[model samples]
Target: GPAFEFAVAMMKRNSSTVKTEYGEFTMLGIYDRWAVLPRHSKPGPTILMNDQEVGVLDAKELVDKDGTNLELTLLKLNRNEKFRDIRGFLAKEEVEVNEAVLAINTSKFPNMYIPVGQVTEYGFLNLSGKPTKRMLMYNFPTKAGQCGGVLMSTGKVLGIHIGGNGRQGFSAALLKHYFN
Candidate 1:
């Protein structure tokens, strides 16, 4: 939990516009979110969304629904954006995966599993100021023992955590939809 708090503090130090949990009371703080696995050769990265791990995702299919929206063509996506690409990181080692966690790997096609220690690159530009799809521009090598996660401006899920300027960032999409 200290790491989570530290991440929030780092964001705050960056002068990011953060929204408190479950309210429009906007401020500068850190919000836990899901760390989406971007495309990668190895799947060592671990996604930390509010203290929970969204299964250790591996390489799979990827699809572009719209310009900014990227729906996994093969992988299964957990219909909640609150914990959306909350953030991604490299795992210390390979951990056991299950259906619930595996299920989150939902998408249209297979998505490139963002390695554990790799930084998820590529995303979308929220030009319309609304949630849109995004993709990674380039793939980076990741390793185990690295940390990758995302922060949020909104406490609710589906908030504009990622997808900005065709690059990667943070959001709380799952936390809002999946959890209370």
Candidate 2:
């Protein structure tokens, strides 16, 4: 099936499409790429923000000498002016459980939904190929194309969507470190 179709199916199973001034894209509160790593692999080409074309500043695959577990990949995305509007929603501090989450699903079209959940864990994880130490885990299910970012019900950003298939997202605290 087409990627978009799969995205829709995934959403139906659990997730939305939302359109923004920049274009159409989904809201994903972030990664589990570490499990799939073979001996070694490089970061795939093309990094996008809510479907907006952004330049790839750098891609690094951290690996052991023998090429064992590809520990992680660190990616740096060029600050795109297009993300200005959504910045306000990104998580700025540590989040707790029972907090409302606003997921912006833009996979098919512009859509937004409120998901109930909380911060299950606080740690580091690779989100969208970027190593974020201050990552937060949520008790939510997510799929591909949904790991961009999500907004807290409090009108703050929960975090950048990174991992899925169960656990999701990294605290957006680093968002400023990168974008600003």
Candidate 3:
């Protein structure tokens, strides 16, 4: 199978794609009945006022690890599409610095989905605009659309693509418990 098929695109919508400030999102991976994405990509609780829905969180809400850690979120599909377990599709591998990894890109035709790169470094880094206790950096560039896609190695999954500011990632270990 191909390594690029795993990461997919995402957005929030009522019928048509909503005109909002979320930019866009790339799915990280799939769980049994949920589409998992980077927790950073999932907008916090919102309230619609005029044109768009905006995040309205408070002091205490911002302090939790939900607002911490380079973590993940499970998104429910609006309509059922043909799908399967990613764990069964691509084997998961250990994450380490300097090892080559693929940043899944869903932005262009022929897709070239896999942007080959190496894991340049790891540890605390600011991603999604918050300082995470841990994160991995890659030596490549990715678009905002590729924000929550998978960070793969060789032909296996290594972590979730947080963003391109530093090409951040959260290793597979963070979501390993959901596989079974």
**Best candidate, lDDT-wise?**
3
Per-residue lDDT of candidate 2, residues 25-72 (tens digit): 343311111111101123244434445454446655443345432233
C-alpha local distance difference test of each model = 0.25, 0.41, 0.44
Model 3 score (lDDT) = 0.44
**1-180 in candidate 3: lDDT tens per residue?**
233333332111111121124545444325433455555544445422223453333212112245565455544443344234555433343355344444433332112345555564476666546666445566565555565555654434556666565343343223344444
Model 2: runs farther than 4 Å from truth? 1-92, 126-132, 167-175
Off by over 4 Å in 3: 1-21, 43-67, 88-94, 97-110, 166-174, 178-180
Top candidate, metric TM-score = 3
Q: Report the C-alpha displacement of residue 69, candidate 1, in angstroms.
A: 8.8
By TM-score, how accurate is candidate 1? Answer: 0.23
- Kindly give the stretch of ten consecutive residues in candidate 3 with the minimal lDDT sum: 10-19
TM-score of each: 0.23, 0.45, 0.57
Worst-scoring 10-residue span by lDDT in model 1:
97-106
Overlapping backbone residue pairs in candidate 3 total 1
